[PDB]
Structure formats: structure tokens, C-alpha cells
Design a protein around this ligand. Sequence first.
Ligand SMILES: [Zn+2]
Ligand SMILES: [Zn+2]
Lengths: 142, 64, 300, 97, 105, 108, 58
Amino acid sequence: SIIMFEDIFVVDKLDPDGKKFDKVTRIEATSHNLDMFMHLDVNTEVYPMAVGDKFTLAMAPTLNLDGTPDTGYFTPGAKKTLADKYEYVMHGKLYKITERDGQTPKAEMYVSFGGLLMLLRGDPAHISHFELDQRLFLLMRK
Amino acid sequence: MIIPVRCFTCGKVIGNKWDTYLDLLQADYTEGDALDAIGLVRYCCRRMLMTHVDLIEKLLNYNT
Amino acid sequence: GATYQRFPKVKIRELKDDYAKFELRDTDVSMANALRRVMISEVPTVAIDLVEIEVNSSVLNDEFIAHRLGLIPLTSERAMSMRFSRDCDACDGDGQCEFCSVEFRLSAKCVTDQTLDVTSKDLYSADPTVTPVDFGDSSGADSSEQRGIIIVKLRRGQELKLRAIARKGIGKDHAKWSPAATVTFMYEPDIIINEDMMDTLTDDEKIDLIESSPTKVFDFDAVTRQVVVVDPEAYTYDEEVIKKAEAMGKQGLIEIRPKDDSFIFTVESTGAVKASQLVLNAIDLLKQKLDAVRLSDDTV
Amino acid sequence: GQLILQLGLDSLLSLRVMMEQVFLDKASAQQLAMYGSRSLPSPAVVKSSKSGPAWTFFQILQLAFPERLSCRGDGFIVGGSDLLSFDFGVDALASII
Amino acid sequence: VPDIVINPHAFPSRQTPGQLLEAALSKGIACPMQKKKGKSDAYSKVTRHATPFSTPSVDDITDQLHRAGFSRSGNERVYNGRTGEMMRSLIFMGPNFYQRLIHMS
Amino acid sequence: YERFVVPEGTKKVSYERDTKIINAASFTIEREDHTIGNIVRMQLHRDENVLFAGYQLPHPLKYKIIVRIHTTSQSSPMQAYNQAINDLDKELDFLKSQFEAEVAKFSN
Amino acid sequence: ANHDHGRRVLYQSQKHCQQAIGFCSTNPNIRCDTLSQQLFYPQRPLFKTMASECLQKD
Ligand SMILES: [Zn+2]
Ligand SMILES: [Zn+2]
């Protein structure tokens, strides 16, 4: 069970400030059971999402489910048992963390999926993560 | 001067089709019917026959 | 050493002496493009490559006549077994040989007052019956004119004596050796026209958006009020039909998708080589090129 | 006081059409990877339901970089020879480059 | 195959739409004309006159290209000569009278 | 003339083992173009244990190909390269067989 | 010709038409001058203009 974070989220506002591209939108999500704020840039060709849907999100630091921390890259392989239980996965890099959060709200976690961005807002039970070190995989289901 | 062999774009041999072209235009045909009679489907050869300037005769008259 | 091998299929629609069409499928685009490029530029042919003019007294010039002689197609069926003249041990005498260097002859003169024209059928070839000038554009086909390719026209005091030497070459050296004169292919479309959107819109709109097609792809079946694809292979990928469907706002009406396989060729020929002989020489030269690039000698 | 070398006619058009097509396939990506340097990064979208992997074009832009670049910009953020974020603005594209 | 290929950055600045109109006119001349069986000789309503101050309209040229079988916008779909697959952008083709100038180098 | 097949003093194919990455080589093929490089790379992409298949021409005027193969373990560049060439040769065999069959249905 | 900018038509009708390589003469055995030039296969255009049709000079 090599998972740093795992929760379920609901979408409430597509197109927050401007629809910058034909196929890339920013998606606002709001959590449950951990209560958090959640923004994400998603490809809306291979996986579009309507408003008022549900999806469970994970964060594995390495995709093959045996604690072997190699990058792998062999994801369409025949069967070596990776974490392809879920449906939408995209590798990325965390580049600025703000778990210092020296005011009233919670932490700020900014990652970059090579040009797609994610905003996860929450301090409690998120203190596993680091500043650099591109290992996040962002599995999405439902 | 004379008609060029090998239509410049594609490469079909057209170097023999000149006199039958003149005879088909001589009979009563228009140019579209004549080129469809000789069998030139793509326009790279049709532009090579319709725009040929035949200057060999003016050269033959002015020699001696 | 696994399988890693896809299995092509050929099915021929038409085949004449200088024409073909076959529905090659289950192979990738790059293989079809390789066949096209080999047939245009790699397959060899015999053509005139050297000219000695003894007398020229016409109104044309020497390079004009030599340039017209270079383009006259010669029948090349022993050219796959001939050799490049840089690779011949013999024949260093600027003359006739038996594995390259066929020699031609030409002489003509007019003594009447009737404007004699010198055609391709005045070229007489030594080493006969193997590389003559081509006659299929004159006889064996009632296409245009049996007089053949005109070279010069002459008057009384005018003559032309020369001797040409044909050799072997390929289309990358000059355009005179390329035997193709048309080699092309195309995809073939997958058209998945909806019937639950087509019964919505009205009959005048039906006969309008059928009319917007520049080639007769669809047909209007008036007896059942419906439409019908009658010829997919005349679709030319210009999207005008689906664009007028977009302007009429009826989305999901028709969709058109090029299939990954199924490459309909169309091969023509100058008449130097037959069509099926061009395809088979292309496959053989691809095998020779794939043979000459192996590193099988040192495995590690 | 500026650079005497800026991107000209066809190159800027190539960048515009590469921006409006944000995703690339595998084969075009590995074909473009032959040119610059830095072999190739891992794909952005590593799988989906329908296609295989998919790259973004910012990862394609990384291949021309030198080694261990770290600079801060108006829209560009570069940490360790990677292009982390890049602003939307196509109007200011001859400036962010 | 084309005989001369030029850059599309030359046209929106120098303000010569006459070259595009000339290419479309000549391409509509030299092509054949389908549906010729019955109802017409099918080669008589063909415009060949690009007289300067009295010129054919856009609708004449585009409806002629529709009659000849090609696309009304002037473009034409091509395949690449290297990869061999479909080039995504439709290409504008057609004949044009070019010239060769002295003082070669 | 000299533009065609490689003269004496130069191999047709020149191998080079890449230094900085394991399972990596660069095949510098003389006297070719897009015809062979394209079919080689698209045959390589149908393999299992391959990772990176491309070709590029170091100048578009000069008549040579450089091919690069990154693979996994359980294989090498040499194995998948010769696998590609031999399977393309087998497909040209099967294609020539199909075409010479289909010529016979124009029975004379 | 009324579609182009006026500068382009000035170019074509004063300099480029006067320089293009094409026909030279129909008796080249007598013109002994410096740098006579000529094409091989001259042509006429696919279109027609009024003046080129009334003049009938190709
Ligand atoms: Zn043609
Ligand atoms: Zn010899």
C-alpha cells in the first residue's frame, strides 16, 4: 500500500477565470472526509468531466505496487502488476510547497505536470510530501 | 519550339500527341472535348498542350 | 526472435499493360511510401546517355536535339540484369558492349519540298530486339498518333547524322531514367452516417447538403426519401460536406474517418517496363537494400 | 540593450501552432527528440483510457536547454533544466521566449 | 507535384490577391469537366478572360472550381513525401505564369 | 557518380555504443534516405522491449541516416535492429508471394 | 491588374517584363550582338486578356 494520499472529491466550477485552451481546463474540486480545496489542469479530450460528478483521487510516489521506487516507464507492459486499477494517471513534479502556512488557512501544495498545474490546499495529514523530487503520480478514478 | 516530350510535372509522354490535337481541333472539337478524346485526365498535361507555342514553322521559313 | 510481423493482402481491381490498381491492406503507411519512392526513383531503365553529332544543318541546335533524344523511352526489360557502366571491366572504347552500352544510329535528309520530319521511328539500334525505341505508343494501342515522337523537322539542304549510346541509370541521377510517370496511393474512408439525425432535417436541406459535395459521393434515394453512400473512393478529404453540416448546426449527422490500413494504389508507366514488373522490381530492390545494411557479422 | 537575435518568420509560427496543439503523440515526440539534447523526459499524461502516453509541448521545449538551468520569470519557471510552468499568453510569446 | 513552392508569409503584407485569383482561374481552366453526358456539351460556360478593369467575380471562379470537381475554397488535400501520412492543413495549389530574369549568378 | 554507393575506405553501417546511457546505441547508416529509415523505425515501434526509435538526417543535402535505439534489458540495440531488418525481409517475401498470386487471376 | 497594389504593377510593367527570358528572334544567323538569350520552350498563359487577344502576339 504505497500511497501518500487518497481521498474523494466533487467538482463544482469548471472554467474558473478563462478557458485558456481548446482541450485544457482548470477544474475546481472540494473534498470530503478531509475537507480541502482542490484545483487541477486536466486534459478534456481523453478524460473530460462535467459539473457535479464524483472521483476518488490518489497520490502514489511510485506506480508499481511493490515498493520498488524505480521510474519504470513500462506502463503499457503485459502484466507486471502496476497500479492500473485506476483510470486517469499523470506523472508530475512538485515545485513549491507552503506547509509553513503562517496565517489562518492551511498549506499550499503546487505541482507541475510538465505544464499542467495542480493546487491542493491542506495542512493536516499531508506532511509526507517534499519540496522538489518529482515522484507524484496523481491517480484519478470515477 | 516543338512540343516537349515528358510533361514537366508528372512525366507522361506527350511528344507524339500534337498532330492529332491539331486535327481534333480542326474537325470541330473544342479544347475540353479534344483533351478528353486524347485521354489526358490530370491538368498538368492539359496545361502543357493548351499553352504550347509552336515556333518551328517561322524558323523554317526564314533560313535561305 | 518473436513474431513481430504483420501480414499484407493484395487484391487487384484493374490491370492492363501500363496500368494497375490494387487494394493493399494490413500494412503500415511507411511501407506503401517506400514502394512509391522506389518505383519513382530507384527502379532502373535504359535510356540514351551519349550523343556524337557528325553533321547538323537544321534550325535546331545540338543540345536541343541531344536533350530530346535523352527523353525518348526505350524498352528496358534486360535492365535489371545489366550493369552500371562504372562497374564494367570491358567497354572502355566509347562504343557498343554486351552488358551495357547499346549503340544507336540515326541519319535522315530531305530532297523533296515537303518538310520532312524526323521521328523516333528513324532510330535504328544495334543489339536489336532487346532495347529498341518504344512502339507501344504507336502500335498495339490506337491512342494518339503512330508517327511517334517528333525530333526535328527538315528542308532540302538539311541533314542530321549522329550516333547515340544508351546506358543504364536510375531516376535519382536524371529524370530520363524514371519509369514511373504516375505512382500514387490514397487511403480509403470510413463513413458512419447517422440515420436518427438524418430523418430529423427536411427534404430541401437533404438535397442541399448532398449538392454541396464536389464529387458524387452520396446519392439521394427519393423513393425511400433517404440518402446513400454509393462511392466512398471518390471522397477527396476537403470536409466541405461536414462543414455545411456544421453551418446547418446538425452535429452527429455524418462523420468521416480515414482507416489506418487499406491503401488503394494507382500505378502507371511510360511503357519502358510493364506495371507488375515495376512492382516486383520494387520489392526486389527493397530486399537488396535491406540485405546490404545488416550487422550480422559481429553479434557482440 | 536587447538581443540581436530573435525568432523570425517560420519559427514563431511553429511555436504558435505547437501552443494551440498542447498534446503530442508518442511517435512525433520521439522523432523530435532526436534533434536537441536531454534525451527525453517522462510523459506528462502517462496513461488514459483511450490513448497510450501523451506529452505536453513544454517538455518538448526542454530539449534545447543547457544543463542545470534555474531562472525565474514572468510566466516561465525553470528548475533544474525543466520547464515547470509557462503562462498562457500567446500574445506575448515572442517575449517569454 | 508542384514545380515551385513559395512561403505563405509573402501574401498578407504585399497585398497581391491577384496571384491567388490567377492561380484559381487557371486551375479552373485546365481541369476536365465531369457530368458531361447529356444536357450540355459541358465546356462552353468556361471563363478565360482576366481583363484588368472588367474581371470575373469570386462567385464565378469558385462555382467553376465546384463544377470542375475540386474544393470551393481553392485548397487541396495532400500527403507528405517523407512520412507518407496526411498533412493536416489543406494546401492551395494551381498554375501560375512565372518568369525568369537576366543577370544570373 | 560519387553521390551513390559508399566508396572504399568507409563502411556501409557504422556502429557506436552510447556512453552515458545503458541499452543505447546510434547506427550511422550511409547512402540512405527516408525510405529505409521510416520503415525501420515503424517496425521497431511494434516490438515489446524497445523504448525509443528515431532517425534524423544531419543535413538535408547529405545522403545518410543516423538511427537511435534505446531498449530495455532482456535485449539490446543489436538484437532489435536485426529483428527489425529480418522481419521486414519476411514481409517483403510474403508481399511478393501475394502479388505474384494476384497477377495469375488475369489468366491468359 | 486592378487587384494588385500600384507599386507591384509598376515593378512588373516597367522592369520585370522588360527583363524576362523568352523569345529572341526568328533569324539568329544575322543578329551579331552581345548576349542574345532565349528559352527552349516558350509558352502563352492559360487565361486570356482583351489586349493579348486583339493584338495576337504570343
Ligand atoms: Zn500527370
Ligand atoms: Zn562493357
